Design an enzyme around this catalytic site. Structure first.
Site, PDB file in Angstrom:
ATOM      1  N   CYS A 186      -5.898  -0.222   1.576  1.00 46.04           N
ATOM      2  CA  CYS A 186      -6.119  -1.654   1.787  1.00 46.04           C
ATOM      3  C   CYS A 186      -7.439  -2.114   1.173  1.00 46.04           C
ATOM      4  O   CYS A 186      -7.532  -3.184   0.572  1.00 46.04           O
ATOM      5  CB  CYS A 186      -6.134  -1.979   3.266  1.00 46.04           C
ATOM      6  N   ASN A 195      -2.063 -10.219   2.907  1.00 47.88           N
ATOM      7  CA  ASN A 195      -1.974  -8.818   3.328  1.00 47.88           C
ATOM      8  C   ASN A 195      -1.302  -7.995   2.239  1.00 47.88           C
ATOM      9  O   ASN A 195      -0.785  -8.558   1.278  1.00 47.88           O
ATOM     10  CB  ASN A 195      -1.192  -8.712   4.644  1.00 47.88           C
ATOM     11  N   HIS A 249      -8.724  -2.806   9.050  1.00 41.60           N
ATOM     12  CA  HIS A 249      -7.924  -3.187   7.898  1.00 41.60           C
ATOM     13  C   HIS A 249      -8.715  -4.109   6.978  1.00 41.60           C
ATOM     14  O   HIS A 249      -9.539  -4.890   7.439  1.00 41.60           O
ATOM     15  CB  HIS A 249      -6.648  -3.878   8.379  1.00 41.60           C
ATOM     16  N   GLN A 258       0.783  -1.233   0.000  1.00 40.90           N
ATOM     17  CA  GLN A 258       0.000   0.000   0.000  1.00 40.90           C
ATOM     18  C   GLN A 258       0.817   1.286   0.000  1.00 40.90           C
ATOM     19  O   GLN A 258       0.470   2.255  -0.684  1.00 40.90           O
ATOM     20  CB  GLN A 258      -0.924   0.060   1.222  1.00 40.90           C
TER      21      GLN A 258
HETATM   22  C1  LIG Z   1      -6.405   0.387   5.075  1.00 43.96           C
HETATM   23  O1  LIG Z   1      -5.400   0.831   4.168  1.00 43.96           O
HETATM   24  C2  LIG Z   1      -5.730  -0.243   6.325  1.00 43.96           C
HETATM   25  N1  LIG Z   1      -4.743   0.749   6.849  1.00 43.96           N
HETATM   26  S1  LIG Z   1      -3.336   0.060   7.291  1.00 43.96           S
HETATM   27  O2  LIG Z   1      -2.349   1.107   7.215  1.00 43.96           O
HETATM   28  O3  LIG Z   1      -3.123  -1.079   6.428  1.00 43.96           O
HETATM   29  C3  LIG Z   1      -3.495  -0.517   9.030  1.00 43.96           C
HETATM   30  N2  LIG Z   1      -4.321  -1.591   9.202  1.00 43.96           N
HETATM   31  C4  LIG Z   1      -4.673  -1.950  10.516  1.00 43.96           C
HETATM   32  C5  LIG Z   1      -4.193  -1.254  11.654  1.00 43.96           C
HETATM   33  C6  LIG Z   1      -3.326  -0.149  11.447  1.00 43.96           C
HETATM   34  C7  LIG Z   1      -2.836   0.132  10.133  1.00 43.96           C
HETATM   35  C8  LIG Z   1      -5.283   1.670   7.907  1.00 43.96           C
HETATM   36  C9  LIG Z   1      -6.459   2.627   7.588  1.00 43.96           C
HETATM   37  C10 LIG Z   1      -6.847   2.819   6.107  1.00 43.96           C
HETATM   38  C11 LIG Z   1      -7.399   1.559   5.335  1.00 43.96           C
HETATM   39  N3  LIG Z   1      -8.653   0.960   6.075  1.00 43.96           N
HETATM   40  C12 LIG Z   1      -9.839   1.062   5.491  1.00 43.96           C
HETATM   41  O4  LIG Z   1      -9.991   1.639   4.388  1.00 43.96           O
HETATM   42  C13 LIG Z   1     -11.029   0.435   6.289  1.00 43.96           C
HETATM   43  C14 LIG Z   1     -11.369  -0.929   5.654  1.00 43.96           C
HETATM   44  C15 LIG Z   1     -12.128  -2.047   6.437  1.00 43.96           C
HETATM   45  C16 LIG Z   1     -12.615  -1.568   7.782  1.00 43.96           C
HETATM   46  C17 LIG Z   1     -13.368  -2.460   5.691  1.00 43.96           C
HETATM   47  N4  LIG Z   1     -12.133   1.391   6.106  1.00 43.96           N
HETATM   48  C18 LIG Z   1     -12.072   2.739   6.358  1.00 43.96           C
HETATM   49  O5  LIG Z   1     -11.198   3.302   7.036  1.00 43.96           O
HETATM   50  C19 LIG Z   1     -13.155   3.520   5.740  1.00 43.96           C
HETATM   51  C20 LIG Z   1     -14.305   3.152   5.178  1.00 43.96           C
HETATM   52  C21 LIG Z   1     -14.866   4.348   4.597  1.00 43.96           C
HETATM   53  C22 LIG Z   1     -14.006   5.385   5.010  1.00 43.96           C
HETATM   54  C23 LIG Z   1     -14.224   6.792   4.684  1.00 43.96           C
HETATM   55  C24 LIG Z   1     -15.416   7.071   3.970  1.00 43.96           C
HETATM   56  C25 LIG Z   1     -16.266   6.024   3.479  1.00 43.96           C
HETATM   57  C26 LIG Z   1     -15.996   4.657   3.783  1.00 43.96           C
HETATM   58  O6  LIG Z   1     -12.992   4.886   5.737  1.00 43.96           O
END
Ligand SMILES: *[C@]1(=O)[C]N(S(=O)(=O)C2=N[C]=[C][C]=[C]2)[C][C][C][C]1[N]C(=O)[C]([C][C]([C])[C])[N]C(=O)C1=[C]C2=C([C]=[C][C]=[C]2)O1
Length: 215
Positions: free
Chosen positions: A25, A182, A162, A19
């Site tokens: 993600c 991942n 995530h 990423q």
């Molecule tokens: C994803 O890229 C995961 N990152 S990370 O850096 O890989 C990480 N993972 C776990 C713990 C710490 C670091 C972190 C955040 C960004 C992203 N995550 C998402 O996009 C999640 C996905 C799952 C929960 C389904 N969703 C959102 O944050 C999300 C959904 C949305 C939104 C904004 C507006 C509309 C829908 O944010």
């Protein structure tokens, strides 16, 4: 045969990806499932464009995060998703520049796995192929996973932060698990992958927001 599956052996899963400094993600999880259905339907393994999703799925927030369902919906009504090759991943949102010319796949909708039901997720992985799932990857124990069947009593199934891909399931040291792809580079975990606890009360909420695209 065995009570397990691994679509890596069918050539359904493309190489691990990273990423970068973009919360994409969801985009990689979406591309992953799409690529699997694409291989299953056309017999060709190909990297689809995660940037296409980051810059065009307006119902999401680009590098701010998003949901895989919104992504599949987009592909469906946009009537196509460009390949990685045609829409490179730059790791920072920019104007939507989707081009019909580089279309490498399409979607006809998506189905969601019943919330918290690991048996249903198992059946889905079995019938369909790689499935998109959301998890709690907060714990630092997750941060430096390298082998074995990950399981941390501290995981919170209510804390989905995530998005990743379930490409199979099986058993290990007598440990039922899920084969998770991942997107933090092949360097992280066992070559980018990680085995997570299965039938362990929906550990880390593996089955709380799972889905797959129709194709
Ligand atoms: C994803 O890229 C995961 N990152 S990370 O850096 O890989 C990480 N993972 C776990 C713990 C710490 C670091 C972190 C955040 C960004 C992203 N995550 C998402 O996009 C999640 C996905 C799952 C929960 C389904 N969703 C959102 O944050 C999300 C959904 C949305 C939104 C904004 C507006 C509309 C829908 O944010």
């Amino acid at each position: 045969a065995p009570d397990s599956v691994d679509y890596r052996k069918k050539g359904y899963v493309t190489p691990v990806k990273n990423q970068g400094q973009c919360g994409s993600c969801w985009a990689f999880s979406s591309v992953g499932a799409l690529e699997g259905q694409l291989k299953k339907k056309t017999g060709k393994l190909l990297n689809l464009s995660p940037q296409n999703l980051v810059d065009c799925v307006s119902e999401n927030d680009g590098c701010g995060g998003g949901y895989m369902t919104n992504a599949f919906q987009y592909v469906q009504k946009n009537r196509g998703i460009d390949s990685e090759d045609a829409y490179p991943y730059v790791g920072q949102e920019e104007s939507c520049m989707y081009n019909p010319t580089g279309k490498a796949a399409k979607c006809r909708g998506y189905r969601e796995i019943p919330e918290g039901n690991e048996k249903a997720l198992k059946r889905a992985v079995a019938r369909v192929g790689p499935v998109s799932v959301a998890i709690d990857a907060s714990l630092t124990s997750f941060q430096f996973y390298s082998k074995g069947v990950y399981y941390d009593e501290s995981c919170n199934s209510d804390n989905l932060n995530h998005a990743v891909l379930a490409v199979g399931y099986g058993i290990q040291k007598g440990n039922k698990h899920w084969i998770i792809k991942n997107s933090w580079g092949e360097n992280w975990g066992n070559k980018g992958y990680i085995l997570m606890a299965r039938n362990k009360n929906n550990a880390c909420g593996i089955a709380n927001l799972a889905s797959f695209p129709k194709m």
